[PDB]
Amino acid sequence: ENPAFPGTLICDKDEVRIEFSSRFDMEKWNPSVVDTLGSEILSCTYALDLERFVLKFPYETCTIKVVGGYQVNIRVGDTTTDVRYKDDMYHFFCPA
Amino acid sequence: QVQLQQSGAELVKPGSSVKISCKASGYTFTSDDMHWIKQQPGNGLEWIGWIYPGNDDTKYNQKFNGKATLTADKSSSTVYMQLSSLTSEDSAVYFCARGDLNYGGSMDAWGQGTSVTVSS
Amino acid sequence: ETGDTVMTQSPSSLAVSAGETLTINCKSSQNLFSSRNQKNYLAWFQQKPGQSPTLLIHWASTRQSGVPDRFIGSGSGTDFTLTISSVQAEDLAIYYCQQYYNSPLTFGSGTKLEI
């Protein structure tokens, strides 16, 4: 029913990894990590690789600590407009 | 110049269905969203869902899943909302509103409202 | 309702006279600020009895064309305020705050004004 996460998410040792099949997909969805209030985390030290179309989000600065691991909140949507309610929100858990 | 003309009020028994039409004029029909809003008598406003007549993309409030169905006819520049299995909670005034995608989808233009009354 | 952005509007009702200035507060459970356009997604609506709602403020600070300057939208990502200076008889209505940053779009419970 609801949209499925457009990329591939992988919990790594020290970071969250989001992979896409092309740069077109990654720039189309433009994933960002947000806090409990839904604002993008500007102290997040993520890395972007457009050779392999991968986004890496370190747990410490980009995710929220909970019992057993981290919760990551991801927002995707169109970057060509200021219409924000068509964006999609996703929440994942990565065990420590 | 922008006008939204909804169909007239309707009175039905519980369990029946109604289809509310909203005809848009004064702007490019497929370039904006159409929002539907429910106002119960003596109560506030509740957001049902939006439809984009361009590609017929839709988004619903999960509370209204299965209750409301949005469709759009580009030739007539008219958006339809179908309400089914009507109960007493479904008696309300229903507004269509244009989400202006230039300004973030904010709803500047509203229809006059359609009163749906469910009684047995 | 999980994941929905909740709009908490206060007070529920207001009773005032003529010429004084009232303030309506609306707080959101989620930030409505977009770093892209550096704006907060919040609208203020006025609805008189027997009429469709009317958009007063959008972007939480910007008045619609033809709206008197006595309506002042203000506030920050979580906290928003609508101030109506020198209230007039035609300002008698119910006022709603709305967030359009997220789907589902949500309203405040509303503020009844009676003079």
Side-chain angles (χ1 to χ4, degrees), chain A residues 85, chain B residues 35 37 45 47 97-100 103-110, chain C residues 5 7-9 24-28 32-33 39-47 53-64 67 71-77 79-83 94-102 105-111:
Chain A
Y85 62 64
Chain B
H35 298 262
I37 303 90
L45 304 171
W47 182 81
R98 181 192 75 152
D100 192 348
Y103 301 95
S106 58
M107 317 183 296
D108 52 326
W110 293 60
Chain C
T5 299
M7 305 307 297
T8 307
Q9 184 177 350
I24 296 171
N25 186 263
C26 188
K27 194 181 177 172
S28 175
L32 312 178
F33 186 76
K39 293 176 177 171
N40 269 305
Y41 287 61
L42 180 99
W44 287 100
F45 287 92
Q46 174 207 73
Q47 185 174 15
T54 291
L55 178 62
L56 298 177
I57 315 299
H58 71 104
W59 295 134
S61 58
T62 305
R63 275 195 305 280
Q64 284 286 125
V67 177
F71 300 88
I72 295 90
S74 62
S76 149
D79 223 329
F80 297 91
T81 301
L82 173 67
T83 301
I94 307 178
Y95 292 87
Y96 301 94
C97 49
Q98 182 205 224
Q99 65 86 26
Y100 49 112
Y101 191 68
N102 292 318
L105 289 69
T106 51
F107 295 87
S109 57
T111 300

Side-chain angles (χ1 to χ4, degrees), chain A residues 18-77:
Chain A
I18 303 178
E19 306 189 355
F20 289 81
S21 57
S22 65
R23 170 170 171 170
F24 181 86
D25 283 11
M26 176 164 278
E27 296 187 326
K28 171 187 179 182
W29 295 102
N30 186 39
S32 64
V33 289
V34 304
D35 53 23
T36 55
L37 290 170
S39 293
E40 185 174 10
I41 304 170
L42 300 180
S43 48
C44 166
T45 55
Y46 75 81
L48 170 57
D49 185 344
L50 280 177
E51 179 190 335
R52 282 176 289 271
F53 323 121
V54 174
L55 270 170
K56 294 180 169 190
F57 296 95
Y59 290 138
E60 188 66 23
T61 60
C62 307
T63 71
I64 310 172
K65 186 69 185 54
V66 296
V67 193
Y70 299 92
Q71 286 185 16
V72 54
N73 314 309
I74 305 170
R75 186 178 189 108
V76 298

